[PDB]
Amino acid sequence: SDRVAQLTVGNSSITTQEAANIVLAYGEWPEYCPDTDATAVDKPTRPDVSVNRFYTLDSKMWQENSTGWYWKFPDVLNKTGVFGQNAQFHYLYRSGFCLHVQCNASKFHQGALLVAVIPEFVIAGRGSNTKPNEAPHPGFTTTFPGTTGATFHDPYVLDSGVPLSQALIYPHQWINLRTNNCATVIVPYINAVPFDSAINHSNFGLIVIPVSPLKYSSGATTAIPITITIAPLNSEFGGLRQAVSQ
Amino acid sequence: SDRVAQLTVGNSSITTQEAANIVLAYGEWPEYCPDTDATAVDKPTRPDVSVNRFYTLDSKMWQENSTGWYWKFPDVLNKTGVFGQNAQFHYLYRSGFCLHVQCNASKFHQGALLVAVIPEFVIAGRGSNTKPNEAPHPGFTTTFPGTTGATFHDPYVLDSGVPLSQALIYPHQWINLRTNNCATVIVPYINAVPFDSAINHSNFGLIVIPVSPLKYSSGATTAIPITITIAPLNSEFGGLRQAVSQ
Amino acid sequence: SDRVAQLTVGNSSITTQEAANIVLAYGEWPEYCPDTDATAVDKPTRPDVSVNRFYTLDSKMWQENSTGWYWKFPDVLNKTGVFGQNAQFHYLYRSGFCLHVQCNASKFHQGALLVAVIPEFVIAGRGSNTKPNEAPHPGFTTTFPGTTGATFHDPYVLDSGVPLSQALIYPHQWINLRTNNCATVIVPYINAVPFDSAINHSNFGLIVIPVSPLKYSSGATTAIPITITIAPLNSEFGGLRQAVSQ
Amino acid sequence: AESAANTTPSSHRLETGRVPALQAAETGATSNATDENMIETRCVVNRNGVLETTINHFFSRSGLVGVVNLTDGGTDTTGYATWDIDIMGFVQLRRKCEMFTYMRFNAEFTFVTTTKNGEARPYMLQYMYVPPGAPKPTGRDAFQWQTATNPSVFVKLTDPPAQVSVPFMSPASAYQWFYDGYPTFGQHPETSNTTYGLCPNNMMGTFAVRVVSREASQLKLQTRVYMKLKHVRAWVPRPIRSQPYLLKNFPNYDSSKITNSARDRSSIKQAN
Amino acid sequence: TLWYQTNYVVPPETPGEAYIIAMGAAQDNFTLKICKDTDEVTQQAVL
Amino acid sequence: TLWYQTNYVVPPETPGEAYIIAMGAAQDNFTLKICKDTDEVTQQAVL
Numbered sequence A, B, C: 001s002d003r004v005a006q007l008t009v010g011n012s013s014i015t016t017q018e019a020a021n022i023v024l025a026y027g028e029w030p031e032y033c034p035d036t037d038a039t040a041v042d043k044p045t046r047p048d049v050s051v052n053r054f055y056t057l058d059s060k061m062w063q064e065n066s067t068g069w070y071w072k073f074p075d076v077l078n079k080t081g082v083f084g085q086n087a088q089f090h091y092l093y094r095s096g097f098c099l100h101v102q103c104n105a106s107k108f109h110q111g112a113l114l115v116a117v118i119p120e121f122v123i124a125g126r127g128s129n130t131k132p133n134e135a136p137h138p139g140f141t142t143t144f145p146g147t148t149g150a151t152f153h154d155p156y157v158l159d160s161g162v163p164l165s166q167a168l169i170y171p172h173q174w175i176n177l178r179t180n181n182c183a184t185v186i187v188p189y190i191n192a193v194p195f196d197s198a199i200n201h202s203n204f205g206l207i208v209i210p211v212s213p214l215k216y217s218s219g220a221t222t223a224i225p226i227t228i229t230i231a232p233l234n235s236e237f238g239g240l241r242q243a244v245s246q
Numbered sequence D: 001a002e003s004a005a006n007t008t009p010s011s012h013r014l015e016t017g018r019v020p021a022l023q024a025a026e027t028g029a030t031s032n033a034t035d036e037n038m039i040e041t042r043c044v045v046n047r048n049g050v051l052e053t054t055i056n057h058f059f060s061r062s063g064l065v066g067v068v069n070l071t072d073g074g075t076d077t078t079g080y081a082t083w084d085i086d087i088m089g090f091v092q093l094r095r096k097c098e099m100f101t102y103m104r105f106n107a108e109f110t111f112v113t114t115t116k117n118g119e120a121r122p123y124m125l126q127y128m129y130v131p132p133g134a135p136k137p138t139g140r141d142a143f144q145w146q147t148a149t150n151p152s153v154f155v156k157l158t159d160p161p162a163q164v165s166v167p168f169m170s171p172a173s174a175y176q177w178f179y180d181g182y183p184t185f186g187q188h189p190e191t192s193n194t195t196y197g198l199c200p201n202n203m204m205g206t207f208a209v210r211v212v213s214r215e216a217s218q219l220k221l222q223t224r225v226y227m228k229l230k231h232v233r234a235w236v237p238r239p240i241r242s243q244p245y246l247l248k249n250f251p252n253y254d255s256s257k258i259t260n261s262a263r264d265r266s267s268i269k270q271a272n
Numbered sequence E, F: 001t002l003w004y005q006t007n008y009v010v011p012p013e014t015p016g017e018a019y020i021i022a023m024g025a026a027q028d029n030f031t032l033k034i035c036k037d038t039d040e041v042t043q044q045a046v047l
């Protein structure tokens, strides 16, 4: 009665057979903005059925020489559906997120994945140049990968100069192929400002890094996809104006 | 405490490790005939220890090109033991049945079986002739297969012109080799008459049809038998006379 | 909540995933010697933290043509640690023991082990000579194998003329590689005298005999070790004098 | 309980969850599945007794223990005939007694003495029990036969066989037939450990017998010892030996030429 | 008599030969009477 | 020290090389005192 769970948000449902306990980030539930902490005067809109649902991204084939992938979460759902449309028309934004990462295999495969969230996950340029005009900086497709995603070049340093070993302080979960096949994290709104633009500022970002490499004997299946589903819980929007893309 | 079960009827017992819930057909338990619905005047006999027990039939090797097998249940136990002897001497008969189908495999085999009961399972002849003298009709070994059993020719139409897909309205159970290895159905006495001859009328019949074919890798076991056990619960007999065979 | 167990004695701990119930030998817990049954006048010492802990012996590779191994338990810990040092200096000794035998394998290996204790397990010589001067007697390394252990020559007769089949009357436990990977027996002090020398008298002895041979397909692991851990519960020592080795 | 066990009336079950026939044997416990949790039984009031299967009714048999020869010659004479008190000389009572580890009981020793050809002539005998530590009599006219501070029995051959009662006199709290140790300290050899398994807690002295006369008596007697156990308590039950015995104080067996515990069959798929 | 109900199915890369250990005991209504000598030992070597 | 208790047994058609991830933390009686500078950085490039 602990390994099974059915999460229902809107008109979507996620059933599970091999699950650990759900993770609540920092022990705080995602709620609406109170009147004491708010600062805008205009009334925010709350669809609560059209943007609060499970959106499924693409799947990535977990190979043997894989490094890892990452995402900017207020920027992945920036163009997909009613949530993206409602976020392009508005200037302010505040919501939490519910995550679910699917990765199933047989009882003859071995491996482990580290899925965690990092608030203000800043991508660092890679180089040994200190001159201001040639210092390497990541492009826009590297900082904000969109709905597709981006890969790691040096996943041992999280592409930011911070070691992967010490990244266990964040809200994290493991996907051990002998124990479970999914990981679930519920993260609230974490920012130093009440509302913020969901276009030029990503609050946090998911990262999936295979710590133990994928191994199997010759004869089993070779395509191991990595699927991710996200539910924008308790969404609020303010400052209605023209729709901008980026 | 749900996957394990020990059924005890008479001097027989069936233990299980991989089991689903037991199925009670139409929500009615098999009981004795009341005085309001009965019509015969002579007192019926009730051994209750000599005919109410688990009788085990033969085993059939589940191959890869298998279609399916079926049985006429008041006619399979027509010659085996005290039940068959007591049914040959009597004219009237009324009992329920308890079933159990055994099919075990390893955790590297895949497949699924559909075991269900069909009241008044009438075998249809196979042909495209409408003349009365050449219209094909099934033989006696096809209508009543005996303790051995009969195979299907067109299991997609249940050998009766009714599709197998719609056969889920009957009291059924699945044998999925990754979930369980047995199926259990308890069916009461279902007929439009209180008593009836157990020689020239079969009330219902079991059918086992592999929906998903048996698949395995080269190196595992290849002999997968299909074993069936039947307990004639709450048996009654009336009209004692000479013993007839068929 | 029955298959998991964590035994803690002193500064050691044994965690388990695949476990049966713990065995308490003869339904009696190992306790201290009461004043009614005791006979010595000097006060015995009780460290209770320095000798009461899990001592791990060596590991033995379980091959396919293996016969079995055995041990003399008051003589295996005769030289290892504070327990052995405290037992060399003293003349009297009385304690119980807690056992744990580790043997793990995959879900594709098969086999079974019979681990049990035999009070006063006397090794018998092997031969057909009745003359007193040539009658074969076991050596000291065969009677008391030490911390290493000894192998069986005829494990069908337990190397003592008593059949292995009838050895199920002893406090025993099975290690079936499809059910569990460990066995646990808690045995109290069993002797006809209150105290006794732990140097020239072994109270009982463990024996591990593979009843079902180890079988596996070509491609799996081949090194299957046999690890044993012992906790000398409720130890008492008396008669302090010079330290003797054997 | 004076009877064995009564049977409760049972019936059939049609329900999930209750599995009384799936008792796991890996736990080391015995299957506790009764008949009432299985095939439908009836109500039987059993009044079969269990009194005969107790330990005091199982060890209340005499059996042969020792055979002592006494030639009493004229030119190659000895006079006396000692017999070390041990139970391992005959395999019947030994097999009946070595199915336990620790025992404690009393004795009812009985002495049946016959002649070579078999004849009860009125010759008076003297049965002496020499405790461990006492000097043994050396000769039919020795100093030790005075039996001062020493129990002895005077009986003739025409009399009924003598019978005395013997208490529990081991220095330990109970006897033992299997001693996994050594009697003394020191370095033990690797060639021939002839002192392994020896228990000093079982040497119950020596039993001697002579013929009470002056000159001699040309007769070869043959005494038999019958020991009846009583007030017996046993601990730690041990399996029964399946191999033939070879020595008295050692459970040695044949390495080659092994005796199987069950005889051979025609095939495994055949009951007869 | 021990019969094969369905089959002994086995996946690939797995040995297809197992074993069954048979145990035996007595229930609570087990009763014995009239003591006699066993027939497992008839002769004996002089010890 | 991490020792091998019995063995690492593996069935056929299964890789025979696994890995163990070691984690570390502190209990509730963990106590620190006397603040000083770290020795993980000694020099630095002019930023």
Ligand SMILES: CCCCCCCCCCCCC/C=C/[C@H](O)[C@H](N)CO
Binding pocket: D085, D086, D087, D088, D107, D109, D127, D128, D129, D151, D152, D153, D164, D166, D175, D202, D203, D204, D207
């Ligand atoms: C007056 C003559 C009496 C003759 C009997 C001697 C009395 C002492 C008998 C002691 C009874 C001992 C019974 C067995 C003891 C030890 O277990 C055996 N020696 C070893 O098998």
